[PDB]
Curated annotation (Swiss-Prot):
It comes from Homo sapiens. Changing residue 49 to A: Decreased rate of activity. Ubiquitinated by SMURF1; leading to proteasomal degradation. This is Ubiquitin carboxyl-terminal hydrolase 5. Substrate binds at residues 39, 51-54, 89, 91, 94.
């Protein structure tokens, strides 16, 4: 349906130790020159570009390629984080999802969504 369901990964997500401090702006894909359509993987804090859709819109597939190598399922679209939530995608469930632990998962990378 249209409503975003809770990811089965959200409660128990393992976030790796020694995370980067993710700034509030100015990000780049670590694999190419893209400065828009960037996805923060919530396990490892990688910042990588969104996929090429079958219409030829979107990025260079760096975040999806990283998922295929790591199995790390949850990513948040940088620039969509507000006090009211964010755009969160599950590669595993293949859907936009709700992460009830989003505030904690972002706080891991020094992101205060409330700000
Ligand atoms: O990228 C990544 O690596 C991570 C994010 C990701 O894989 C992903 C996949 C599917 C969706 S979606 O199902 O919500 N939807 C898919 C069609 C999109 C679209 C594109 C162009 C349009 F012109 C349009 F009208 C719609 C809008 C978004 C959202 C995100
Ligand atoms: Zn890229």
């Amino acid at each position: 349906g249209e409503v975003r369901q809770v990811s089965k990964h959200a409660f128990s997500l393992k976030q790796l130790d020694n995370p980067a401090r993710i700034p509030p702006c100015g990000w780049k894909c670590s694999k190419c020159d893209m400065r828009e359509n960037l996805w923060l993987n919530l396990t490892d804090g990688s910042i990588l570009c969104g996929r090429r859709y079958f219409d030829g819109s979107g990025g260079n597939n760096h975040a999806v390629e990283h998922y295929r190598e790591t199995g790390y399922p949850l990513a948040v679209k940088l620039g969509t984080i507000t006090p009211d939530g964010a755009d969160v995608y599950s590669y595993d469930e293949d859907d936009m999802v709700l992460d009830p632990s989003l505030a904690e998962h972002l706080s891991h990378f020094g992101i205060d969504m409330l700000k």
